[PDB]
From a paper:
With the exception of α-hemolysin, which is homo-heptameric, leukotoxins are bipartite toxins, formed by the non-covalent association of two distinct proteins, a class S and a class F component of approximately 31 and 34 kDa, respectively, into a likely octameric species. Panton-Valentine leukocidin (PVL) is associated with necrotizing skin infections, such as boils, and plays an important role in the poor prognosis of necrotizing pneumonia. Two additional structural domains are also found: the rim domain anchors the protein to the membrane surface, while the stem domain, closely apposed to the core β-sandwich in the soluble form, contributes two β-strands to the pore β-barrel. Since the binding of LukS-PV to the membrane is a saturable process, the necessary presence of a LukS-PV receptor on the cell surface was thus proposed.
The mutants exhibiting significantly decreased binding abilities with respect to wild-type LukS-PV were: R73A, Y184A, T244A, H245A, and Y250A, with Ki values ranging from 1.8 to 6.2 nM, i.e. a 69- to 238-fold increase compared to the Ki value of wild-type LukS-PV. Four LukS-PV mutants (R73A, Y184A, T244A, and Y250) displayed significant alterations for all measured parameters, i.e. at least 50-fold decrease in affinity for hPMN membranes, 2-fold decrease in the slope of Ca2+ influx and 2- to 10-fold reduction in pore-forming capacity. The Y250A mutant crystallized in 5% PEG 6000, 0.1 M sodium citrate, pH 4.0. Crystals diffracted up to 1.55 Å. In the case of the rim domain, wild-type LukS-PV and mutants T244A, Y246A and N248A displayed only small differences, with r.m.s. deviations comprised between 0.20 Å and 0.30 Å, whereas the structure of the rim domain of the Y184A and Y250A mutants were markedly different, with r.m.s. deviations of 1.10 Å and 1.28 Å, respectively, when compared to the wild-type LukS-PV structure. Of particular note, the rim region was generally associated with weak electron density, and could not be completely built in most structures, except in the case of the Y250A mutant. For both Y184A and Y250A mutants, crystallization was achieved in different conditions than those for wild-type LukS-PV and the other mutants, resulting in a different crystal packing.
Numbering used by the authors: 2 to 284
The structure:
Amino acid sequence: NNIENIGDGAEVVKRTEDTSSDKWGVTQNIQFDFVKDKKYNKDALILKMQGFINSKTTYYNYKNTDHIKAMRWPFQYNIGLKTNDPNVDLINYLPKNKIDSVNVSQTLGYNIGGNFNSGPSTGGNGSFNYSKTISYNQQNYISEVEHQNSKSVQWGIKANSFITSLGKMSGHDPNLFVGYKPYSQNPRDYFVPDNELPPLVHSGFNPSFIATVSHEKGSGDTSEFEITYGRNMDVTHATRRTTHYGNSALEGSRIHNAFVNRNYTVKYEVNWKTHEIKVKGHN
């Protein structure tokens, strides 16, 4: 339906899937680009994983106590791709290396014969028959590949370094996001305002990741892929201790990994012969 000629007898067959979950607060917008090149001895599929993961940050009374309030927030965003097809191999993924740049912008370039290049989106690596670019912001967060093998890749985009009213804080600091004194008994009012929170905490994350897989020609028409987007959430408790003597400022405590793997997983079936992509299921 949507095919691009990429020169020298090759073409790219493009398909996009877009699926949202109100339950998980996730949109997976996936681009599936089949590279049809007679000069490359395997079938190739480039996946560009975009969409949005809501932060799902919430505020509540800890055990409905009078003076302990809680903030549930995304310590890490999860992006993962996996297959169970023995005929498929993961051949590249971007970003490949740990990266803390506020903006991550990279390009995967393809040249006839199964040649792939990873480099800056600004170029300087050469001319390609086809290319795909990723771009995402991750202010105060850091991206890393948590694991990768021939069948899967998982990234974590985690809370890293913050500028607070008390100076620099790591993503593990128990006082992170805790206010000075409550403005009211509303649980929100024990934590700093939205302007003092990064977009990844107040709003969410706009992923932009690439993975390329190869498939043995003539080995089977279909493969299943599971793509997972989600969050691992931490809880910060802020406690107001009344004293006529010391510091009555709020004190923070952290429950690290309070609600892990809150993920939306979608199973996609890829047909290497027809180029039909279909959703097989989801949670």
